[PDB]
Amino acid sequence: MTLKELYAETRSHMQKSLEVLEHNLAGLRTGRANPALLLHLKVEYYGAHVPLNQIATVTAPDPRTLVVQSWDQNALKAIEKAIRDSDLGLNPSNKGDALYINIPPLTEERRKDLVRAVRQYAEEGRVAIRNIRREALDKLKKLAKELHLSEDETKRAEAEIQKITDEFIAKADQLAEKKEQEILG
Amino acid sequence: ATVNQLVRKPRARKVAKSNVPALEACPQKRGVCTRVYTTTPKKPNSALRKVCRVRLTNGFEVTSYIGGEGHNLQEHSVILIRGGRVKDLPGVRYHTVRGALDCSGVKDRKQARSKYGVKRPKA
Amino acid sequence: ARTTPIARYRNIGISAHIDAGKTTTTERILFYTGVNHKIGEVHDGAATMDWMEQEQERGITITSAATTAFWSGMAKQYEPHRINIIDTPGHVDFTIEVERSMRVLDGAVMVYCAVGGVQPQSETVWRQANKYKVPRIAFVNKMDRMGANFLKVVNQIKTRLGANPVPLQLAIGAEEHFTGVVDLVKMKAINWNDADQGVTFEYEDIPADMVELANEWHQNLIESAAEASEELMEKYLGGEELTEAEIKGALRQRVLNNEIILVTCGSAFKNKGVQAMLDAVIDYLPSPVDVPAINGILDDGKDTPAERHASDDEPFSALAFKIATDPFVGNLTFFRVYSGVVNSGDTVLNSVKAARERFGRIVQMHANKREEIKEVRAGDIAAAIGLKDVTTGDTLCDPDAPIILERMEFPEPVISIAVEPKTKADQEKMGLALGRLAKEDPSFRVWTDEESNQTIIAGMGELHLDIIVDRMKREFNVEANVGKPQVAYRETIRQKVTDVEGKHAKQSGGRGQYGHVVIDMYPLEPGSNPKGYEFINDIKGGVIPGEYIPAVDKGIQEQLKAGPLAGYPVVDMGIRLHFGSYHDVDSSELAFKLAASIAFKEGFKKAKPVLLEPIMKVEVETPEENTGDVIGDLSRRRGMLKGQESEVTGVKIHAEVPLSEMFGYATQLRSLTKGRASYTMEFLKYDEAPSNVAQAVIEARG
RNA sequence: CGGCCGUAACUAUAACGGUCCU
RNA sequence: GUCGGGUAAGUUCCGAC
RNA sequence: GACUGGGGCGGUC
RNA sequence: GAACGUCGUGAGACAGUUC
RNA sequence: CGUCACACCAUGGGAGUG
RNA sequence: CAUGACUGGGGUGAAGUCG
């Protein structure tokens, strides 16, 4: 174990935890009226199980409407089963070649129970990156003995892994913040 | 018992429990219709029947049966509850009047016109 | 009852746009016409107007209350007799409602703003209205503004509006210095002494500069006159004068046959010269002696024409022309009686939508007071309180008498503005408003589905479309530009994807349960079928037990409809069971439930939806300069044109615009076509986006 | 006075199963 | 911290988890 | 123990 | 001053918390 | 037969709130 | 008497897991 190979491994690992974080934010069907709402409805296209972007675009003018633009008349429908549902639940209206979407609860309330979950799950993702820092640190301890780095040296190097973690924490916050604009859409 | 045992604690009655939330001692009650369901019957029978939650004028919400060979209610249409529970459908101890308020009524029915929604056919 | 005949009843209208001074003109008209105001008060400014500060103003005026604004001769100039002013419209564009109103009144006064000449709103209504026969005289109002001379106003009436206008009056002064009108038919020139009336009027000079004008306008009167009759045309052509009697005869003839539009002047804003014009309405525009009849056809089929004619002895017939909702006992349905008589507490017939009516209490609404009456006679006008199915345009007749006297029904074209909720709070408020609107007006339009797809709102008259939309967005709130149109769909999903495997082969649940299917989904014709759906067994009982092939298949089918698709079930897709496994000699209910469950988890993932969106036939009628602009509106509204043909003052574009793409269509359309358009929106088809519909809409849009 | 992994009807959780060491 | 409450708005406070 | 871009930790003698 | 978690054989310590 | 998932229904307890 | 974060047990259901 040399610093460079630990870092290369860490960069791989942490990225997977950061990906778990992206997942964790996107994966509660977000704050009902979102783009991330609709990736719980991967739509079957060309016999493939295609991601949301290839069948629609999702714009938002306010937190109470969700406009889902689908270039073709047919396409708007196949997106429509993702605005709708009951865990992605909404009641769409046709306005554009897009649905402008009136909210069924009581000026929304299904958006809340999901948004709290999203932020908690986001932190579970961050915790995962920090646990990866712990594993990286464990390896940093082994590396330290091997290259004869002292306790202070390894703890400074561990702090450096923690700073690298914190870049992904910063990105985690950014990821969350992007989902926040969706929630506020 | 015995006269004595009766003079003390006579024969108690029995508060008749009228299975009906939309009581108010009425033949029927107006509603609003929350939605239109299609729940399944009990174990002995099959086939999905039509029902719907109603927001009775007295607040007392309750699902009413929508008998007839042809539904036509909306998630806002105003119907009139009558009574007569239904077995296969539990909790559904009511039925929406056929041919009243903002509801509709069976179509092409030529037998038992009184019931359902029909009044003297094409002659 | 009545004492004055049909002839000495004058059903006359005022067709006047907003630009002539909507408020001022109506107050002044109620005063002017044969007293519908407090006794006297006709000299000097403000005192004239004491009647309206004390009680009711506006309406439509029955007049002849015999104490002010009369003339000395019977049926000569003003009054001695009944003059009923039923209003006419001349705003925006022509509609069936505009046509309908013009027919209740027997004559009309078209009113123009002097400065504006002929504004857009007046012309569009006029050319279309002329085709369905409407006699009009022109009243150049607002002579306290510019255009307060014949030449400016008259060119606009010919050019913009397409009538033949001609001078027969000369104005004295122009703008603020205007104070008089010269009558070139009675040969007086009049200076009005008050800014309300003109009592203590001074017959005055014609200024030297206007002597010439007056003589030319008199000559223009003679030229116009001569066209009436072949005899007059001979005399004119050589040179020979057409005397007072000749011109008077010609004026009556040409106005009643709508061969001309006489031009008069007088401001109803500075309130001088109006009175002279109103005398001419009484003298020369039609009365019920020229229209005592109303003609229908049977309500049962269209078997025979049936003609009504005035006579108390003849059965009742009346045309309802307006509905108001009085808080007294509800809806008052104003009607003009053509024949017969109706008495309070009678049964009358709604002889066009075939309902029996209970004629309750009948009232005549003066513009100052409410007076309950018990009877109406032939020629009388009144409002009945409480009717079953008689509303605006609807026919009233005796207890029974089938006859179509309504030749344009109360349900009217879908010209809509969209009232849109956005929150559940707004959705709740919407529901209350729609219920309320239906009960007062059954002929409004709404488009709606539950919780969303709601509402596109249409009115039934010029005030009406605005009034209904305003109350919903203002008083009862609404957060605009979200939901507005009803929908309904089916899937048409197709794709050749050989695989999805569902294999369950465990000990769960209960006994050992095994079910395995592999299915190939292959394209089936994108129909309009909501059922779909073709199943082929490539391998039958060897892949799942032959006895059980429907149960397993049914379990997936139900579940698949619930999975990733389009919100509309697997429809117009072909499905091929071609492989699978499991004990083909054993089954249980439980086995098909597990088999279906695993099959469904794999199954949702692979295919390729294709469906439909509603396309609306949007027929837009706008003035012809907007051919550009309708196509422009369509571009901003992803819409297209499929034919565009001229229609009178306007062009009629036959556009296809998706129903789905409206944004409060009338508002957008008006903005892009400069307020001049009208439209109807009817379903054309739901579409797969066909080549012409997709290409054309995109084409307009860029 | 423990861990790692897979898992039921929209997800998320996993009563359940597995497995390593006490 | 999260939910609830009080507030026009409550990194404190009170009730929960 | 010292060296040490204060010293200490680290590292080196 | 005192305490918890954590670090240290320990004196004590913390870019932790707590009165 | 009893947990333990779910989904509804009514109901006891509750910082307190009206 | 109405109501409340959360929470307890009861009842149905469709019947799943575990025995």
mmCIF file with all atom_site columns, C-alpha atoms in Angstrom, chain C residues 58-194:
data_model
loop_
_atom_site.group_PDB
_atom_site.id
_atom_site.type_symbol
_atom_site.label_atom_id
_atom_site.label_alt_id
_atom_site.label_comp_id
_atom_site.label_asym_id
_atom_site.label_entity_id
_atom_site.label_seq_id
_atom_site.pdbx_PDB_ins_code
_atom_site.Cartn_x
_atom_site.Cartn_y
_atom_site.Cartn_z
_atom_site.occupancy
_atom_site.B_iso_or_equiv
_atom_site.pdbx_formal_charge
_atom_site.auth_seq_id
_atom_site.auth_comp_id
_atom_site.auth_asym_id
_atom_site.auth_atom_id
_atom_site.pdbx_PDB_model_num
ATOM 1   C CA . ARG C 1 58  ? -80.063 51.283 -17.448 1.00 0.00 ? 58  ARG C CA 1
ATOM 2   C CA . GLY C 1 59  ? -81.967 48.404 -19.051 1.00 0.00 ? 59  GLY C CA 1
ATOM 3   C CA . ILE C 1 60  ? -84.112 48.410 -22.176 1.00 0.00 ? 60  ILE C CA 1
ATOM 4   C CA . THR C 1 61  ? -86.887 50.901 -22.225 1.00 0.00 ? 61  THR C CA 1
ATOM 5   C CA . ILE C 1 62  ? -90.603 50.708 -22.773 1.00 0.00 ? 62  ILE C CA 1
ATOM 6   C CA . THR C 1 63  ? -91.481 54.373 -23.206 1.00 0.00 ? 63  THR C CA 1
ATOM 7   C CA . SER C 1 64  ? -94.512 56.611 -23.401 1.00 0.00 ? 64  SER C CA 1
ATOM 8   C CA . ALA C 1 65  ? -95.257 57.490 -19.773 1.00 0.00 ? 65  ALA C CA 1
ATOM 9   C CA . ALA C 1 66  ? -96.942 60.673 -21.006 1.00 0.00 ? 66  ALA C CA 1
ATOM 10  C CA . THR C 1 67  ? -95.381 63.614 -19.230 1.00 0.00 ? 67  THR C CA 1
ATOM 11  C CA . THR C 1 68  ? -92.064 64.443 -20.989 1.00 0.00 ? 68  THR C CA 1
ATOM 12  C CA . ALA C 1 69  ? -90.402 64.153 -24.445 1.00 0.00 ? 69  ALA C CA 1
ATOM 13  C CA . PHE C 1 70  ? -93.579 64.028 -26.558 1.00 0.00 ? 70  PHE C CA 1
ATOM 14  C CA . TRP C 1 71  ? -94.658 65.797 -29.735 1.00 0.00 ? 71  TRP C CA 1
ATOM 15  C CA . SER C 1 72  ? -97.848 67.626 -30.651 1.00 0.00 ? 72  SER C CA 1
ATOM 16  C CA . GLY C 1 73  ? -98.878 65.296 -33.495 1.00 0.00 ? 73  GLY C CA 1
ATOM 17  C CA . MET C 1 74  ? -99.885 61.645 -33.259 1.00 0.00 ? 74  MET C CA 1
ATOM 18  C CA . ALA C 1 75  ? -97.023 59.437 -34.476 1.00 0.00 ? 75  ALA C CA 1
ATOM 19  C CA . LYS C 1 76  ? -95.245 62.519 -35.759 1.00 0.00 ? 76  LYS C CA 1
ATOM 20  C CA . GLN C 1 77  ? -91.682 62.851 -34.488 1.00 0.00 ? 77  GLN C CA 1
ATOM 21  C CA . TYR C 1 78  ? -91.730 61.883 -30.774 1.00 0.00 ? 78  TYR C CA 1
ATOM 22  C CA . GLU C 1 79  ? -94.408 59.715 -29.154 1.00 0.00 ? 79  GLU C CA 1
ATOM 23  C CA . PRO C 1 80  ? -97.915 60.131 -28.482 1.00 0.00 ? 80  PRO C CA 1
ATOM 24  C CA . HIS C 1 81  ? -97.554 56.330 -28.570 1.00 0.00 ? 81  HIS C CA 1
ATOM 25  C CA . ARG C 1 82  ? -95.489 53.413 -27.320 1.00 0.00 ? 82  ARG C CA 1
ATOM 26  C CA . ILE C 1 83  ? -91.876 53.098 -28.383 1.00 0.00 ? 83  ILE C CA 1
ATOM 27  C CA . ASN C 1 84  ? -90.127 49.965 -27.129 1.00 0.00 ? 84  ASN C CA 1
ATOM 28  C CA . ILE C 1 85  ? -86.329 50.103 -27.235 1.00 0.00 ? 85  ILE C CA 1
ATOM 29  C CA . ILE C 1 86  ? -85.020 46.519 -27.245 1.00 0.00 ? 86  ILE C CA 1
ATOM 30  C CA . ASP C 1 87  ? -81.198 46.701 -27.473 1.00 0.00 ? 87  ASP C CA 1
ATOM 31  C CA . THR C 1 88  ? -79.192 45.552 -30.511 1.00 0.00 ? 88  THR C CA 1
ATOM 32  C CA . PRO C 1 89  ? -75.419 44.817 -30.486 1.00 0.00 ? 89  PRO C CA 1
ATOM 33  C CA . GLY C 1 90  ? -72.688 46.029 -32.857 1.00 0.00 ? 90  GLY C CA 1
ATOM 34  C CA . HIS C 1 91  ? -69.633 44.950 -30.867 1.00 0.00 ? 91  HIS C CA 1
ATOM 35  C CA . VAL C 1 92  ? -66.696 42.708 -31.858 1.00 0.00 ? 92  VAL C CA 1
ATOM 36  C CA . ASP C 1 93  ? -67.792 40.195 -34.515 1.00 0.00 ? 93  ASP C CA 1
ATOM 37  C CA . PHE C 1 94  ? -71.121 38.755 -35.637 1.00 0.00 ? 94  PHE C CA 1
ATOM 38  C CA . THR C 1 95  ? -72.538 35.700 -33.856 1.00 0.00 ? 95  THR C CA 1
ATOM 39  C CA . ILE C 1 96  ? -75.875 33.856 -33.761 1.00 0.00 ? 96  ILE C CA 1
ATOM 40  C CA . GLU C 1 97  ? -76.649 35.783 -30.531 1.00 0.00 ? 97  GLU C CA 1
ATOM 41  C CA . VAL C 1 98  ? -76.048 39.096 -32.342 1.00 0.00 ? 98  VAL C CA 1
ATOM 42  C CA . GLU C 1 99  ? -78.339 37.950 -35.189 1.00 0.00 ? 99  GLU C CA 1
ATOM 43  C CA . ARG C 1 100 ? -80.996 36.810 -32.720 1.00 0.00 ? 100 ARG C CA 1
ATOM 44  C CA . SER C 1 101 ? -81.088 40.189 -30.944 1.00 0.00 ? 101 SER C CA 1
ATOM 45  C CA . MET C 1 102 ? -81.461 42.139 -34.219 1.00 0.00 ? 102 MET C CA 1
ATOM 46  C CA . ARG C 1 103 ? -84.617 40.204 -35.116 1.00 0.00 ? 103 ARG C CA 1
ATOM 47  C CA . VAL C 1 104 ? -86.574 41.003 -31.887 1.00 0.00 ? 104 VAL C CA 1
ATOM 48  C CA . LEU C 1 105 ? -86.375 44.717 -32.589 1.00 0.00 ? 105 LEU C CA 1
ATOM 49  C CA . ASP C 1 106 ? -87.887 45.479 -35.988 1.00 0.00 ? 106 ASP C CA 1
ATOM 50  C CA . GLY C 1 107 ? -85.638 48.462 -36.766 1.00 0.00 ? 107 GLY C CA 1
ATOM 51  C CA . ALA C 1 108 ? -82.189 49.510 -35.546 1.00 0.00 ? 108 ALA C CA 1
ATOM 52  C CA . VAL C 1 109 ? -79.983 52.585 -35.097 1.00 0.00 ? 109 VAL C CA 1
ATOM 53  C CA . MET C 1 110 ? -76.318 51.903 -35.794 1.00 0.00 ? 110 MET C CA 1
ATOM 54  C CA . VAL C 1 111 ? -74.201 54.233 -33.706 1.00 0.00 ? 111 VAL C CA 1
ATOM 55  C CA . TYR C 1 112 ? -70.654 55.184 -34.635 1.00 0.00 ? 112 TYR C CA 1
ATOM 56  C CA . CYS C 1 113 ? -68.002 57.192 -32.818 1.00 0.00 ? 113 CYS C CA 1
ATOM 57  C CA . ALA C 1 114 ? -67.343 60.317 -34.920 1.00 0.00 ? 114 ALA C CA 1
ATOM 58  C CA . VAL C 1 115 ? -63.588 60.543 -34.314 1.00 0.00 ? 115 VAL C CA 1
ATOM 59  C CA . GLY C 1 116 ? -63.030 56.813 -34.779 1.00 0.00 ? 116 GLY C CA 1
ATOM 60  C CA . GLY C 1 117 ? -65.245 56.798 -37.906 1.00 0.00 ? 117 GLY C CA 1
ATOM 61  C CA . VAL C 1 118 ? -65.988 53.110 -38.165 1.00 0.00 ? 118 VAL C CA 1
ATOM 62  C CA . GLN C 1 119 ? -63.994 51.206 -35.607 1.00 0.00 ? 119 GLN C CA 1
ATOM 63  C CA . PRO C 1 120 ? -63.192 47.481 -36.270 1.00 0.00 ? 120 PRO C CA 1
ATOM 64  C CA . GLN C 1 121 ? -65.874 46.175 -33.923 1.00 0.00 ? 121 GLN C CA 1
ATOM 65  C CA . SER C 1 122 ? -68.745 47.765 -35.889 1.00 0.00 ? 122 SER C CA 1
ATOM 66  C CA . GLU C 1 123 ? -67.778 46.576 -39.421 1.00 0.00 ? 123 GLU C CA 1
ATOM 67  C CA . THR C 1 124 ? -67.466 42.823 -38.805 1.00 0.00 ? 124 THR C CA 1
ATOM 68  C CA . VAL C 1 125 ? -70.903 42.676 -37.240 1.00 0.00 ? 125 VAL C CA 1
ATOM 69  C CA . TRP C 1 126 ? -72.471 44.783 -39.977 1.00 0.00 ? 126 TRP C CA 1
ATOM 70  C CA . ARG C 1 127 ? -71.551 42.919 -43.157 1.00 0.00 ? 127 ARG C CA 1
ATOM 71  C CA . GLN C 1 128 ? -72.556 39.540 -41.751 1.00 0.00 ? 128 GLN C CA 1
ATOM 72  C CA . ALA C 1 129 ? -75.734 41.023 -40.194 1.00 0.00 ? 129 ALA C CA 1
ATOM 73  C CA . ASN C 1 130 ? -76.802 42.609 -43.527 1.00 0.00 ? 130 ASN C CA 1
ATOM 74  C CA . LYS C 1 131 ? -76.822 39.135 -45.137 1.00 0.00 ? 131 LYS C CA 1
ATOM 75  C CA . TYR C 1 132 ? -79.495 38.018 -42.629 1.00 0.00 ? 132 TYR C CA 1
ATOM 76  C CA . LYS C 1 133 ? -81.445 41.276 -43.173 1.00 0.00 ? 133 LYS C CA 1
ATOM 77  C CA . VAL C 1 134 ? -81.261 44.112 -40.629 1.00 0.00 ? 134 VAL C CA 1
ATOM 78  C CA . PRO C 1 135 ? -82.415 47.704 -41.450 1.00 0.00 ? 135 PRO C CA 1
ATOM 79  C CA . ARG C 1 136 ? -80.189 50.411 -39.919 1.00 0.00 ? 136 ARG C CA 1
ATOM 80  C CA . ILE C 1 137 ? -79.786 54.204 -39.850 1.00 0.00 ? 137 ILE C CA 1
ATOM 81  C CA . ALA C 1 138 ? -76.465 55.754 -38.770 1.00 0.00 ? 138 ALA C CA 1
ATOM 82  C CA . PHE C 1 139 ? -76.049 58.056 -35.823 1.00 0.00 ? 139 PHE C CA 1
ATOM 83  C CA . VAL C 1 140 ? -72.689 59.814 -35.785 1.00 0.00 ? 140 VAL C CA 1
ATOM 84  C CA . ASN C 1 141 ? -72.330 60.161 -32.019 1.00 0.00 ? 141 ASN C CA 1
ATOM 85  C CA . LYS C 1 142 ? -69.643 62.116 -30.137 1.00 0.00 ? 142 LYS C CA 1
ATOM 86  C CA . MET C 1 143 ? -69.703 65.316 -32.180 1.00 0.00 ? 143 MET C CA 1
ATOM 87  C CA . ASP C 1 144 ? -67.871 66.938 -29.263 1.00 0.00 ? 144 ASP C CA 1
ATOM 88  C CA . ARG C 1 145 ? -64.808 65.157 -30.611 1.00 0.00 ? 145 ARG C CA 1
ATOM 89  C CA . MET C 1 146 ? -63.161 65.190 -34.014 1.00 0.00 ? 146 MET C CA 1
ATOM 90  C CA . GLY C 1 147 ? -64.818 63.841 -37.147 1.00 0.00 ? 147 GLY C CA 1
ATOM 91  C CA . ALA C 1 148 ? -67.749 66.110 -36.294 1.00 0.00 ? 148 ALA C CA 1
ATOM 92  C CA . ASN C 1 149 ? -68.424 66.813 -39.947 1.00 0.00 ? 149 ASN C CA 1
ATOM 93  C CA . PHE C 1 150 ? -69.965 64.518 -42.529 1.00 0.00 ? 150 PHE C CA 1
ATOM 94  C CA . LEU C 1 151 ? -66.974 63.959 -44.806 1.00 0.00 ? 151 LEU C CA 1
ATOM 95  C CA . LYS C 1 152 ? -64.652 62.223 -42.303 1.00 0.00 ? 152 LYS C CA 1
ATOM 96  C CA . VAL C 1 153 ? -67.267 59.860 -40.854 1.00 0.00 ? 153 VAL C CA 1
ATOM 97  C CA . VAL C 1 154 ? -68.914 58.998 -44.203 1.00 0.00 ? 154 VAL C CA 1
ATOM 98  C CA . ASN C 1 155 ? -65.756 57.708 -45.914 1.00 0.00 ? 155 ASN C CA 1
ATOM 99  C CA . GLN C 1 156 ? -65.217 55.172 -43.111 1.00 0.00 ? 156 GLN C CA 1
ATOM 100 C CA . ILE C 1 157 ? -68.796 53.864 -43.381 1.00 0.00 ? 157 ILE C CA 1
ATOM 101 C CA . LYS C 1 158 ? -68.250 53.082 -47.066 1.00 0.00 ? 158 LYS C CA 1
ATOM 102 C CA . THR C 1 159 ? -64.737 51.733 -46.783 1.00 0.00 ? 159 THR C CA 1
ATOM 103 C CA . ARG C 1 160 ? -64.463 49.850 -43.496 1.00 0.00 ? 160 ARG C CA 1
ATOM 104 C CA . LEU C 1 161 ? -68.029 48.675 -43.268 1.00 0.00 ? 161 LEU C CA 1
ATOM 105 C CA . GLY C 1 162 ? -69.134 48.301 -46.893 1.00 0.00 ? 162 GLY C CA 1
ATOM 106 C CA . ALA C 1 163 ? -72.510 50.040 -46.677 1.00 0.00 ? 163 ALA C CA 1
ATOM 107 C CA . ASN C 1 164 ? -73.618 52.983 -48.791 1.00 0.00 ? 164 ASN C CA 1
ATOM 108 C CA . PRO C 1 165 ? -73.608 55.982 -46.457 1.00 0.00 ? 165 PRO C CA 1
ATOM 109 C CA . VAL C 1 166 ? -74.796 59.361 -47.504 1.00 0.00 ? 166 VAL C CA 1
ATOM 110 C CA . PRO C 1 167 ? -75.134 62.881 -45.937 1.00 0.00 ? 167 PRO C CA 1
ATOM 111 C CA . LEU C 1 168 ? -78.628 64.147 -45.092 1.00 0.00 ? 168 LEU C CA 1
ATOM 112 C CA . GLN C 1 169 ? -77.672 66.469 -42.223 1.00 0.00 ? 169 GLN C CA 1
ATOM 113 C CA . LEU C 1 170 ? -75.043 69.139 -41.832 1.00 0.00 ? 170 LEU C CA 1
ATOM 114 C CA . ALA C 1 171 ? -73.490 69.807 -38.418 1.00 0.00 ? 171 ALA C CA 1
ATOM 115 C CA . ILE C 1 172 ? -73.185 73.274 -36.890 1.00 0.00 ? 172 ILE C CA 1
ATOM 116 C CA . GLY C 1 173 ? -69.715 73.588 -35.435 1.00 0.00 ? 173 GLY C CA 1
ATOM 117 C CA . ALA C 1 174 ? -67.282 70.796 -34.758 1.00 0.00 ? 174 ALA C CA 1
ATOM 118 C CA . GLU C 1 175 ? -65.657 69.474 -31.558 1.00 0.00 ? 175 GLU C CA 1
ATOM 119 C CA . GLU C 1 176 ? -66.303 71.644 -28.467 1.00 0.00 ? 176 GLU C CA 1
ATOM 120 C CA . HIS C 1 177 ? -67.793 74.417 -30.639 1.00 0.00 ? 177 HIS C CA 1
ATOM 121 C CA . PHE C 1 178 ? -70.423 71.995 -32.011 1.00 0.00 ? 178 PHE C CA 1
ATOM 122 C CA . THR C 1 179 ? -73.772 72.992 -30.528 1.00 0.00 ? 179 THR C CA 1
ATOM 123 C CA . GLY C 1 180 ? -76.231 72.420 -33.367 1.00 0.00 ? 180 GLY C CA 1
ATOM 124 C CA . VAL C 1 181 ? -77.537 70.117 -36.084 1.00 0.00 ? 181 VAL C CA 1
ATOM 125 C CA . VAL C 1 182 ? -79.218 71.153 -39.342 1.00 0.00 ? 182 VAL C CA 1
ATOM 126 C CA . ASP C 1 183 ? -82.114 68.994 -40.472 1.00 0.00 ? 183 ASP C CA 1
ATOM 127 C CA . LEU C 1 184 ? -81.963 69.054 -44.308 1.00 0.00 ? 184 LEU C CA 1
ATOM 128 C CA . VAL C 1 185 ? -85.283 67.183 -44.679 1.00 0.00 ? 185 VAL C CA 1
ATOM 129 C CA . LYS C 1 186 ? -87.425 69.431 -42.459 1.00 0.00 ? 186 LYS C CA 1
ATOM 130 C CA . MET C 1 187 ? -85.225 72.385 -43.513 1.00 0.00 ? 187 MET C CA 1
ATOM 131 C CA . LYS C 1 188 ? -84.547 73.783 -40.033 1.00 0.00 ? 188 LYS C CA 1
ATOM 132 C CA . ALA C 1 189 ? -81.175 74.430 -38.430 1.00 0.00 ? 189 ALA C CA 1
ATOM 133 C CA . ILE C 1 190 ? -81.184 73.932 -34.697 1.00 0.00 ? 190 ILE C CA 1
ATOM 134 C CA . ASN C 1 191 ? -78.992 75.252 -31.895 1.00 0.00 ? 191 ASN C CA 1
ATOM 135 C CA . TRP C 1 192 ? -79.446 73.307 -28.691 1.00 0.00 ? 192 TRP C CA 1
ATOM 136 C CA . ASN C 1 193 ? -79.431 75.330 -25.502 1.00 0.00 ? 193 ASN C CA 1
ATOM 137 C CA . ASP C 1 194 ? -78.506 72.664 -22.939 1.00 0.00 ? 194 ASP C CA 1
#
